[PDB]
Write a protein that binds this ligand. Structure first.
Ligand SMILES: *O[C@H]1[C@H](O)[C@H](n2cnc3c(N)ncnc32)O[C@@H]1COP(=O)(O)OP(=O)(O)OP(=O)(O)OC[C@H]1O[C@@H](n2c[n+](C)c3c(=O)[nH]c(N)nc32)[C@H](O)[C@@H]1O
Ligand SMILES: N#Cc1cn([C@@H]2O[C@H](CO)[C@@H](O)[C@H]2O)c2ncnc(N)c12
Ligand SMILES: [Mg+2]
Ligand SMILES: [Zn+2]
Ligand SMILES: [Zn+2]
Lengths: 301, 114
């Protein structure tokens, strides 16, 4: 029952191994609100607990680490999650964020527009996404795999995530994608992580830990999301904000993880073991350049 | 020779009873930090709250040019410590007050150089 003093709850391994069918999600505390410390926004508490959980994993943390954060704006025009990430990450970490709608951010660079317009030369060590389509609320049929930004995210992971890098991509009961689950099997380890402050929501962060660039495990993503909903449906999580009060060990440890460039032929099992243990990043270490594609139209006539 | 003076506009709006800019991003922290004014990571002490700097900057928040030939922002990408008594209006606090170039505390709210 000590779960309440954790930042949240990760999907236990035995639920990952099942072969459930997809049911409707029915949480006993659905929509209940946590008591947050005075004046703290939900997204700050949520991202703090996310980072607290990520402190328990084997993340690679190189010098000049590169982190990109999609879905980083709010209707308030500010970026609370970015502020927590930059607090968490080592000082000097390159942090880029993005959103469809305009906002002001503490990120080093911010691109406004659909994520599909975002391009970059370089590979990344950590990808964070909180994107969610408001139209996902207009539930009018079977809960199928969604595309949209999830299609971009899967390609972005396969194309622009360093080996050894990690991801946290927000899902919900209806905001999910089968290929993203399948791609969780291309990391050394994966889970679905529910924050204790939002334990009453079907939100989770799908976390891929230490990317291997090839399937370690074959995951059927329709089955795995059903497994996730089954877990949530049968394991009520009590809302808790306890962990928000102890920030003494919050900063991500600067491990100085090695970065090597290597061609697809030099990735042997000893390399793969280093990647799997959080001990190696593989990518170019050039300068970081990003860009937003801009559609040009003349509306006169 | 015309430029908008947004600092004065906000100061007068406040003076005439207007409600301060909201949704400044307050951080969770130990509250055992140095208490310095503007830092690379939250540094509030027991008498302060820490905020993400961009959200506390009048120019950032108002979508206007920064008062600086380079337009550089000294809050964005850092954290600003605000006395708890003034945390209802972080934007007003950073506009009205000044950081001591020697000890890095707010003049009047920590700076003991005098
Ligand atoms: O924190 C939210 C986060 O920012 C984002 N989000 C949600 N709505 C958003 C809009 N309009 N704009 C931007 N971002 C938005 O998603 C996070 C989670 O939000 P939450 O409302 O808590 O999601 P949740 O309801 O759990 O999942 P879905 O939105 O995918 O469900 C759609 C639809 O299905 C019904 N539903 C879901 N669940 C889990 C239910 C339950 O347990 N009990 C009941 N009776 N109904 C449930 C709901 O009608 C829901 O709206
Ligand atoms: N569908 C969709 C998207 C949603 N969001 C944003 O995620 C945040 C969700 O809480 C919100 O601020 C929103 O504006 C997107 N951002 C970029 N590209 C997209 N395709 C999306
Ligand atoms: Mg909620
Ligand atoms: Zn500014
Ligand atoms: Zn001084």
């Amino acid at each position: 029952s000590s779960q309440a003093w954790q930042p949240g709850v990760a999907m236990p391994n035995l639920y990952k191994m099942q072969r459930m069918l997809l049911e409707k999600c029915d949480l006993q505390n659905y929509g209940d609100s946590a008591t947050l410390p005075k004046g703290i926004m939900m997204n700050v508490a949520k991202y703090t607990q996310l980072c607290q959980y990520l402190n328990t994993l084997t993340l690679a943390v190189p010098y000049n680490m590169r982190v990109i954060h999609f879905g980083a704006g709010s209707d308030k025009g500010v970026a609370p999650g970015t502020a927590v990430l930059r607090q968490w990450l080592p000082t000097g970490t390159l942090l880029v964020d993005s959103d469809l709608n305009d906002f002001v951010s503490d990120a080093d660079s911010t691109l406004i527009g659909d994520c599909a317009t975002v391009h970059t030369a370089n590979k990344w060590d950590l990808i964070i996404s909180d994107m969610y389509d408001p139209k996902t609320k207009n539930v009018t049929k079977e809960n199928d795999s969604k595309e949209g930004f999830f299609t971009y995210i899967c390609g972005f992971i396969q194309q622009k995530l360093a080996l050894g890098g990690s991801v946290a991509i927000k899902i919900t009961e209806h905001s999910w994608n089968a290929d993203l689950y399948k791609l969780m099997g291309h990391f050394a380890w994966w889970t679905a992580f529910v924050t204790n402050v939002n334990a009453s929501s079907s939100e989770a962060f799908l976390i891929g830990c230490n990317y291997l660039g090839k399937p370690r495990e074959q995951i059927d993503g329709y089955v795995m999301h059903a497994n996730y909903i089954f877990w949530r449906n049968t394991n009520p999580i009590q809302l808790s904000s306890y962990s928000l009060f102890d920030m003494s060990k919050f900063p991500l440890k600067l491990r100085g993880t090695a970065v090597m460039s290597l061609k697809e032929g030099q990735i042997n099992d000893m390399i793969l073991s280093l990647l799997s243990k959080g001990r190696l990043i593989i990518r170019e270490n050039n300068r970081v350049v990003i860009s937003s594609d801009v559609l040009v139209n003349n509306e006169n006539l | 020779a015309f430029a908008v003076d947004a600092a004065k506009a906000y100061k007068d709006y406040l003076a005439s009873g207007g409600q301060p800019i909201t949704n400044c991003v307050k951080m969770l922290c130990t509250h055992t930090g140095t208490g310095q004014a503007i830092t690379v990571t939250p540094e509030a002490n027991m008498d302060q709250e820490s905020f993400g700097g961009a959200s506390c900057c009048l120019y950032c928040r108002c979508h206007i040019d920064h008062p600086n030939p380079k337009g550089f922002c000294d809050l964005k990408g850092k954290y600003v410590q605000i006395p708890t008594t003034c945390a209802n209006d972080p934007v007003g606090f950073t506009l009205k007050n000044t950081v001591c170039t020697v000890c890095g505390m707010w003049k009047g709210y920590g700076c003991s150089c005098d």
